[model samples]
Target chain A: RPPHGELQYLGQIQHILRCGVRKDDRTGTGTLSVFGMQARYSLRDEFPLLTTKRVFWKGVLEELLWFIKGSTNAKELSSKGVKIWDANGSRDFLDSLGFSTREEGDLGPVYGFQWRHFGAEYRDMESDYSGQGVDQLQKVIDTIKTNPDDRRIIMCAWNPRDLPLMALPPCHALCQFYVVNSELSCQLYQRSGDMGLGVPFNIASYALLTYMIAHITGLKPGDFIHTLGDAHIYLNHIEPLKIQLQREPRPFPKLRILRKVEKIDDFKAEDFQIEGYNPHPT
Target chain B: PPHGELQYLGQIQHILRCGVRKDDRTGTGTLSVFGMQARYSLRDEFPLLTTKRVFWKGVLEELLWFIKGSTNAKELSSKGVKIWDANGSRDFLDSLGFSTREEGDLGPVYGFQWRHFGAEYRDMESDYSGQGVDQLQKVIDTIKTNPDDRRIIMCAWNPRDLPLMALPPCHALCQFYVVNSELSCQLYQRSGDMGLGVPFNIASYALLTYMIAHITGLKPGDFIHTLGDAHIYLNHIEPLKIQLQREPRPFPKLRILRKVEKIDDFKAEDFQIEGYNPHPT
Candidate 1:
């Protein structure tokens, strides 16, 4: 039988640790890898933040806001004290790709760029992009408001033509929104997932995105389905993952929006709040 | 325990019974489900269905045509494979903004998209500039070289070119993963006609993955089929439900004769099936 609620996330960790084979990866750090696994989270029950360990909730929210703003530069996020993209957007990495024209901390055609302006030509990071390719994020929001029943409510960050230009290709490649019974559900197809570090951030990020979209579209939040192509646990993270798996899962936290935001971009980081989050610090 | 090919038959039965009523692009109505998954292990046995007879020859020939990168249906029809004739006919395609200079030229269908995808798609009769990326070749190379990489993916769905085609891709994107020296593939299909289309798709992709693994010198692994909108046409419910009642038999085995070096050289005559005892078609 499939594990229910937060146990599903723990179950994946357990399964990968038990049966995953040791494999090499791009980072030169070895990983225990498994292929094709899925986890489901119901927003009606509770927020899907892990109770075994304290997730950095503020960084998750700020990064998500950065994506919604369609900003390719990391300056906004760094100003908000989130330095997750500092390494990826470093001058050294950009210079390695022969991108001397791009400024430091400028991620070239990453998730936000693809979400807002897919298939747009990339001259440099600072060029004006008034009219280029399709805005998938705007289109999805419009479809949710106008025709909720359309099955093709999808936003894809996997543009083949632009894959070569990005600092890193999208791990969460495609997502589709489904509205049934006045509830909005989302399914994310991630190409690769780091089960310990990245999966938690990914789950919370998309779930929050789903809730935010549902709030504006006048629908209740439903389910978040996370599907992975290559799910793996890094060799360095095994001990921490196992320690968290040993702890009992507490009840999930509840998310509250302080203000009723009309547009997706209007909500500030301070407008959101999480309550009743009690977890073991692993 | 997972039933190998019987799970495929079971999914069809499930959709017919519990699917939501919905309208489709085709005027015919359907009972559809949003998402579903099935797994088949290639090491145990070949996953050809045994509940009913399947035309193995037709499947083999069509796969060969796809590997050859031929968009013309006449190549398949020339080998006594008439399955693509309906979609390739002049009158039916004319309504869809497709003009066939030859009798059975299907303009940039599965084969063309597999080989020369995302290029400037001209008419079927015009010569392609050979400018498109060879996804199939790149996938094979990646499998041989960087087996541990997570990005060995081949996608056929191009949004820019979809409006110019006769049909948008149903089996839209697929990714291949190499694990423990065994090759596994996962397909993500956007829309699936469960009764008529999905069975063929399952066998065809599995066969395609198997062929690639064999050529790349790796053991065959599992095939995972993921569907987005799996549905059963209203007309196909009765026969499909009847298929559920039939007991499943042991799966058959497939053999490829003549060690062909190139993927494009495989012929319909080279394939042989064994022990495929099944119920009447």
Candidate 2:
């Protein structure tokens, strides 16, 4: 039998380890980096949660749900036990980035705000008004349902105008949805990625997002193609990754939707159950 | 001697065989693949496809127009380049609901987004010198100052400005990376016409990479093209299949004659294509 595409992820790591160049990055943490990488993971009947290492599924689910709801406050997710954005939303971090007027835990106009209400003016995370900017997420779902042939079904968070206003510019900047014969495939273009830590997390996150969108549109999930600009393995994460690279990739788990959810917003963690997720011990 | 043309030809073959039946905008049913990528190196020779003769003059003209920040198609047409003629025609403008707009006024297209991104695009004729972010300048600066900077990106896909455009950008975003004193670029094209647009795009981005490397004192590396939807139209299917049957020739090397210091200082005449022997169409 022909193999799946998880081998592509492993091959990309092998490529960087062999041919990448060493460079000092912004965090003073040096890296072995390569440019222009593409990995396509099959998202058919199986979900692409990595079995090589543990990808925190609860956090991924909560963060994506937060993004879908258009909530830019980090405290909401932090309160729900996901501390991924806690450091970026800290008062000290905000003030260090010259956001002295902003309150703690307010990730101003980041992924969620850009995803839901793009081109809208942002005063703070607390302020909200209906019927403001374009709802890009909604339009994508609508386009897939109505005009599946439309090539412009894109969700982009890289607003050059609001980039200065954001706490951190989006790394997974843009994604395009393609429909072919009742199958939906998503291509995510990330400007930069941490090969060890971020790439695996982003893969499952976007694959899950594609699955949700596919469910809402009543289409089958296809491949999740991830393209990167500057793909790097941090100096610290390299040794840990070599050990991780030693493990064989197991069969991916299948996600079951427990309830019939029509709207994309109706999805919850309780509704999703990952069956046969055989992840390796950390 | 086939060079990267095999990759392009392979993509064509893949689509012709495994692509699904899909509907498109022009009523031309296409056999489309969802995602594909190919890397064309800019090191020794350029990546212009040699199976079918590409219009090099038109490619140079349009890229120069984009770099000059000119949104008027008439400007390119005035120089005998009519590739953008259809989009800027009055009939097409009205068809796209730009009735009041003047002819050749492609509102907020590629050039406008590249040079003056986020600037208010009232019309194509308006002065937009420093109204928005200069992504072109920023990338060059980053290449020279901090070669390792991961954010050297220029995007043409503006969701806010998509409705105002004559056509949404196919080459949506590009990012530059520098390593081992070589400059590489990656383009994320939302949709690519594999027969016509992809070859021209390969040359354009590879040329851009070389030009930027020249200015930044580096070597040209690779130009990776990632596509969201790579398709062959029903009209061009037979032609591409026949074109694929022909073996690809040697790729040409693009020689920049002048020592241009900045991005804005180059012209079409400055580039000299060497050894471009393509199979006559």
Candidate 3:
């Protein structure tokens, strides 16, 4: 059987320690090696996580919803009290260091912005929609079922030309959908990853995303195929990872999200469930 | 509603040509740009190319067996009458290179070599199998189920230290999976490809892998990804643009083995499907 609970987490942590740490040339600060793992499972069989460490469930939930709004304004994130991007204001940020937005309401092409404002057109090229976000996911699910034979079932996040306009370019760039019999599967390819903290969040975010899509698509959730372009561990996170490894993994708890929420922006902390969770403090 | 049949093929070919002539950068005579794609259908589909000028059936079957055997040698390639290496050798000879009989056998290191090898296991008392094909697909499935937790993964291509490998790598490296119910994929190819090959192949291979996991029982994950040093041949821009303009049709059908319990035991014939009608060449 798979190594039980914390052992697996420890293995992962240790793996990062051994493989991730490295010194940087530009700055003196140590960089944690960037290597991590993403797990795939069907929500129907098991809840995501209630063990290992406490998750920023509220932060995750709100951020997802934030993306759905296609509004890149920090106001939304700030209002929700998630301070992930406190430092990257438009003036000081590299992407926005010299750029300016045409519209006052523009937050730039954030994830939700791209999904919702992606250049989409109907067959006649006359009809249009600003955001293809939620609808795009649904269409892909339908294609995975109806056209399992085509190769164009691609959903792209990277618009090389658009990087300058957005607050941040898409981190999880593009994903493709495939269908087999009744099963719907997905593969997400990321170019850059932070092995320590970033990877864990990345893994959890995508896995949950896959589960959600599966539920709506009428297919069982299968594997979440992940391919990393640059998989490295930061030099600084090694010690912390070691500390985390020493702690035992608490039992994995169940996660229950309120049903009937379709748009990612519509989600709230109350629409979820957490069961049997017990994780050692970091 | 996309253009159908011959027109599609023409567009693909046009894009391929443009990528070859205009996108790729050739140092001396070696053009820079290579591309390839692979597909899997969990139990419902197996991805073996039939449309190309060359048939990869033998190559596919042999590859699967080698993955299962986890052994590498020219002998296996010889038995199948597949001449990938022989022709490759001929090119090498033509380029003023030669190899001894003993040098012919390249070992089992593709997936096995890519995922697991002798590292100075430092963590526990024992060396750990960090990530392998067996776990790679599973992790993806878990991510689908649990979107709130992090740690989704796979590592096949490493840059800082891959020259130490017994053999040169192909299909260099890639990482991708679903995030928040969205499918995403990205590949870090060390060398080769931009137009005629890489993009299409990348889409095909990554997509196929995702399909397998999806069919086995996972959500349709989003693909968020990128490429490091993605380039096209200086000779192939028109074709590339033509391809870009041509609307991509729906995904084609695929087939896979019914009872092959292991990832390595897969075969070419084990993959069979229909309705992948593309525009003619």
Candidate 4:
């Protein structure tokens, strides 16, 4: 019902405005939303840092590195001032979920834990359960090297066995990685997310991850496709979204990996730099 | 990309025009594209694809089998739905490295994975009545209790059990979303067969959404399908080009006769299809 390209995100916003179904968000979040959508942003030559509202690129790199290392501890990301997963690990946030006995800084079986210890039982943030279950991130990378055409090269965070244990179920449910012509392509299927907050960050995050993984494998980052189940344009963000829609998108910035990091785990924010990001200010 | 029923044909057009050639499992080459989305409205009518005839009975019977968590391909093959007949053959099993396995036993495919996630895989003949995570029931409960919950999802693509499977799941994962007293569902299929398989998938998943919505006291909203490797076989190219010429008729409607409470209570006899007319092959 929509279109794709670099302007994919902005076009998605316009379509929702025209044909969205109204809904009372059990907690009154999005007044209007659509059911399904897909966006393809090419990373074949340049990075997809949003040209509408500026996307936070540093936190995007840090957060992905943490997930690759299997750190369910949000405190580690927070200790270095990555603020996204930090609040969820706060004392107030943990207690709000009635995790009174569950301890602090533990976002249970989240993307980090599920990516690594998928089949293993999650005890707490401090426990050692390494070499327990299939490490999907590593598995995906290894499969790309050996068999680039493997169709089942996938990573998922939607584990039903651990949903009750999680503070919040994964919004980005599953991602399938495709290696076409030795260029790595990533498609992320999100179960649900706030259009304003989650989509922009996720677009950068997965694109950056695609680049890093490609860097490690000596391949090229091809495309990043974002699929959303429930794309809700939040009520509070409506006016701001209108402001964003008015601004014309500038040329996308280029992401150049400063060093050749053979391992995906060895990446840092300093190892990457963004070029010509002339995004319209919020 | 175009409209409801037209979207399917539009996708075919897109693939035929821009698809990259790739070798596949069947050694039949495919013109493939990654990351395609198609949405069908399941509001008043079932999406039975009026462009080509869909196997209505096969869709019902196969879904019923998956709902009961039955792994025996012979059980479905006995009902004249021969789709699973080949995969469970002894020769096929031996060829795929399941040498010691019994015939008609597709170990932990969609059925077992839907019902039992983390459970040990025995054989197809064993009773796994109360084992692993019952994801289907979990989905139903979430719809009733927290209809607005974004996490009402059930997946058949279990990586932990992938090697044991005779074939990996094509329509692997699904998520349910509810708004305005209407239930909508989205399926992320990692692989799709456009000619032979995708039409059936459209009806199958749309039917699943209808069945769940009826049980949870809501109207069916939309059926969104997102595909990873959306492809048409080199064999299917000429026939699909003919199909593209035919205009799509209105989608068919589904009527569930009986009031069913439990998800497993419904039978094939209670359901019916109305107003379906397609171009004959």
Number of the top lDDT candidate: 2
**Model 1: per-residue lDDT, tens digit, A1-282?**
334488989998989988899885547698998888877798884788878888889889999999987888877688899998888888999899977778888788888887887767766667777677677888889988987666677777776667777888889878878776677888888889998888988999999999899888889998888888899998888888877888888888999888888988888888878889898975
DockQ of each: 0.41, 0.80, 0.04, 0.68
For candidate 2, write residues B25-44 as lDDT tens digits: 87878888888889887888
Cα displacement (angstroms), candidate 1, residue A33, comes to 1.7
Question: What is the C-alpha local distance difference test score of candidate 2?
Answer: 0.88
Clashing residue pair totals per candidate (backbone < 3 A): 0, 0, 149, 0
lDDT by residue (tens digit), candidate 4, A1-282 = 222255779888888888777676547554678878988999977888887888877788888888888898888898677888877888898898788877678888899888987888888888897789778889989998988776788998888888888887788888999877778899998877577877899899889889989999989899899998888887778789988888877778898989988877777778988988887877
Per-model TM against the reference:
0.89, 0.97, 0.47, 0.95
lDDT (C-alpha) at residue B92 in model 4: 95
Tens-digit lDDT string for candidate 4 (B1-281): 44477889999999999988876755778898988998888889888987889998899999999998999999997888988988999999999899988899999988898888778899998887788899999899999998777778888777788888888888779989888788989989998889988999989899999999989989998899899989999989999999999988877789999999989998998798988898899
Residue ranges of candidate 3 with Cα displaced over 4 Å? A4-13, A20-23, A26-28, A32-44, A94-96, A100-107, A120-135, A144-152, A179-184, A261-269, B1-281
Model 2, A162: alpha-carbon shift in Å? 1.6
Among all windows of 10 consecutive residues in model 3 chain B, the one with the lowest summed lDDT is B30-39
Better of 1 and 2 by TM-score: 2
Docking outcome class, model 1: acceptable
In model 3, the Cα lDDT at residue A236 comes to 56
Chain A TM-scores, one per candidate?
Answer: 0.95, 0.97, 0.76, 0.94
**DockQ preference between candidates 1 and 2, better one:** 2
